[PDB]
Scaffold this active site. Structure first.
Site, PDB file in Angstrom:
ATOM      1  CG  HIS A 286     -31.894 -41.584  -2.611  1.00  0.00           C
ATOM      2  ND1 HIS A 286     -32.466 -40.395  -3.010  1.00  0.00           N
ATOM      3  CD2 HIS A 286     -30.893 -41.834  -3.491  1.00  0.00           C
ATOM      4  CE1 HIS A 286     -31.837 -39.942  -4.081  1.00  0.00           C
ATOM      5  NE2 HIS A 286     -30.878 -40.795  -4.392  1.00  0.00           N
TER       6      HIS A 286
ATOM      7  CG  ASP B 203     -34.416 -38.573  -1.032  1.00  0.00           C
ATOM      8  OD1 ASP B 203     -33.756 -39.265  -0.225  1.00  0.00           O
ATOM      9  OD2 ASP B 203     -34.183 -38.559  -2.260  1.00  0.00           O
TER      10      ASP B 203
ATOM     11  CB  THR C  86     -47.455 -31.921  -1.129  1.00  0.00           C
ATOM     12  OG1 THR C  86     -46.266 -31.633  -1.872  1.00  0.00           O
ATOM     13  CG2 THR C  86     -47.689 -30.824  -0.088  1.00  0.00           C
TER      14      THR C  86
ATOM     15  CB  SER D  14     -29.324 -38.370  -6.221  1.00  0.00           C
ATOM     16  OG  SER D  14     -30.323 -38.929  -7.054  1.00  0.00           O
TER      17      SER D  14
ATOM     18  CB  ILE E 288     -53.179 -31.128  13.189  1.00  0.00           C
ATOM     19  CG1 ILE E 288     -54.383 -30.685  14.028  1.00  0.00           C
ATOM     20  CG2 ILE E 288     -53.556 -31.222  11.704  1.00  0.00           C
ATOM     21  CD1 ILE E 288     -54.788 -29.245  13.821  1.00  0.00           C
ATOM     22  N   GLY E 289     -53.612 -34.086  12.207  1.00  0.00           N
ATOM     23  CA  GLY E 289     -54.381 -35.263  11.850  1.00  0.00           C
ATOM     24  C   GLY E 289     -55.762 -34.910  11.341  1.00  0.00           C
TER      25      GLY E 289
ATOM     26  CE1 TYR F 106     -47.847 -35.350   8.732  1.00  0.00           C
ATOM     27  CE2 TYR F 106     -46.716 -37.394   8.213  1.00  0.00           C
ATOM     28  CZ  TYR F 106     -47.677 -36.447   7.917  1.00  0.00           C
ATOM     29  OH  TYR F 106     -48.475 -36.592   6.806  1.00  0.00           O
TER      30      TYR F 106
END
Lengths: 271, 268, 279
Positions: free
Chosen positions: A53, A83, A141, A158, A209-210, A269
């Site tokens: 960011h 990030d 997560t 940051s 994977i999904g 992904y």
């Protein structure tokens, strides 16, 4: 006697932390600072870690050292999910590198110091403890699986460093009634992993994977295409016992798209 | 060398700290005091709760029983019966807290799961039973948020220093552990805190500034100088009022200013 | 075992810290004495000299000083300074005074544990713990909020004029001032605070050398403009001191007294007459 002090860790880790300056072109002429942040020199090659960011949509990137040396910096790649962003600086006449102990296990209660450039006041050290550990797992997560610390974190911290009393890097500072002493950092072990992958592939390629009970299934996902259905109980993934939803998903991410495994063809992904 | 750390205290005290849940009206934290299943928390956390739930850092959840509460100290005792063994907060009754002592606040701020924050004792406060104000609590620059309430504040040894109660920065308060103990016992026993009440206020001796109408004092005048309360020299307004609270309603005692007063129960 | 604690430092330094009360007579209609604002102060020596922040005592008709031992004193303003936001008071004391521990030989280091002692929100004396985040400078010449000491020790209204000490109770600085910035607070380095105090004690005010390294600009009518110096000049010597640093040079100029005349080499050796800094 002598005054209680963490200056040791400061001497060791500080020099390897740098001020980062995002520079954009203002259409409404020259380069103007869009934002700023901090970064950690990882190794002697000139690789630096920072928050994505911070450097997002930068026309130019500059990196300054506590020894006064300034460098034009190259974006090696970034990652939304963590990030994180890797930079690199050329013209190496030698560099300070952040102390790292890969063997070091972070513990809750460990004294830590956050090194950064909050509000562009110059380098600033702040002291706290590890409030919570988080996870080094590759799979995203949420803000809960980061490292948590009551060390003071502001805008400008940051991409900065979070180190223990020995200067060993514990994590990369990401982000912080008014919540007090709640701030987060990416575990250093994970940051290492992400850096290497960005250095290598110019981006983070994640396996997608999904027992673990299937709550849902992603349409057209690798799972839906292999014949798996809701309510299935997964006991083995690529010959590894699935005893944890977290550990399993972290494992899937390490697997490369195109691969085929016994439980399917892994995909990349979705952004 | 090894990293400077308080992780020791964390290992010892943390397990005995629990997430408390008042649809959910609110949430908070609590401290397991002993093996019987008695827990301390803030009254405001559990007020008007239809159900109370308690979760342990080991994953065990329990339905909880309100044993009683207290407005003045904003404390509440719960209880869960537990077949298995329970973590209890380390306690040293002999330990004297000192200003500057490193302390850690253990709780569940903003329901982020268990969170440790580090600070020092900024000010001691008092363990006296008689209410005073937010000044006689323990004060600490250890970080305290919503969800830290009822949590534990422990020193580097994990020893319980106090119960966390409540832009000002690094100003936070906890009930001194010594007092919390006293309150707990009293709630366990009587289901509420029965305070000896006299109905005076004032500031060796203690000069009566005013007198409570219909109070125990009015029934037994202003500007009187109290030198003895129930055979104890009154050399301190704080120590005297703390003493009165320990006395039970219905009791009768000599007061030398020698009158005879009958203690009542403190007004809500 | 025994609990990790800084109470030692607390025992040593705390008593020498005091609550300060600015009072005025125009505050109310009946012209009584009422608190305009309040703060903290540090007793420096046995004479009764106290340090505090100028903004605390500004426009005070009366000043009051209370000790953690209960003793209260009417206080006299010895002088103040806008630039460092410092003010020296004095109390007429009898029976001895607590004095803040000082080690002039102690070098502050970044990371050193420090405790801020003060009276935030008039809650009585309050200790908060943190570290030195940045050192700042002890130079006399004003610069900005960057050359103060910086600390993540908690500082509120009422900590102003208070003490910032290390684990040994040695005075590191005088607390000046503190999205919501968290754990960013400032103190005047003790070495500098000392310098300022002495100068205020002596002169009733801080007399600073003012002049007005590549010259970016020049002050009209300033000492420099009057001596013949121009933009883009390169200054290599100030009063026979090599000018190798802009910071070190300006701090040096401040120590020089107005009316003084000194050689400046830019080769051209000019003669400048120092003036007093503009308010």
């Amino acid at each position: 006697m002598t005054p209680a002090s963490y200056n040791l860790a400061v001497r060791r880790a500080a020099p390897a932390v740098v001020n980062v300056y995002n520079r954009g072109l203002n259409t409404n002429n020259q380069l103007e600072i869009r934002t700023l942040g901090s970064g950690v020199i990882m190794d002697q090659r000139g690789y630096i870690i920072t928050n994505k960011h911070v450097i997002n949509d930068a026309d130019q990137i500059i990196v300054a050292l506590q020894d006064g040396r300034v460098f034009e910096a190259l974006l090696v790649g970034s990652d939304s999910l963590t990030d994180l962003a890797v930079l690199k600086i050329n013209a190496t006449g030698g560099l300070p590198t952040i102390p790292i102990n890969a063997r070091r296990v972070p513990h809750i209660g460990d004294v830590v110091l956050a090194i950064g450039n909050p509000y562009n006041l110059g380098q600033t050290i702040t002291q706290g403890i590890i409030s919570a550990t988080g996870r080094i797992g590759l799979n995203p997560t949420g803000r809960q699986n980061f490292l948590q610390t009551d060390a003071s974190i502001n805008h400008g911290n940051s991409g900065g460093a979070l180190v223990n009393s020995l200067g060993e890097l514990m994590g990369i500072n990401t982000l912080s009634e008014t919540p007090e002493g709640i701030g987060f950092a990416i575990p250093f072990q994970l940051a290492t992993k992400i850096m290497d992958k960005l250095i290598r592939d110019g981006r983070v390629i994640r396996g997608y994977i999904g027992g673990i009970v299937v709550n849902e299934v992603s349409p057209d996902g690798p799972a839906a295409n292999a014949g798996i259905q809701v309510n299935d109980l997964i006991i083995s993934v690529d010959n590894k016992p699935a005893i944890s939803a977290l550990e399993t998903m972290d494992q899937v991410a390490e697997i490369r798209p195109g691969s085929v495994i016994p439980v399917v063809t892994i995909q990349e992904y979705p952004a």
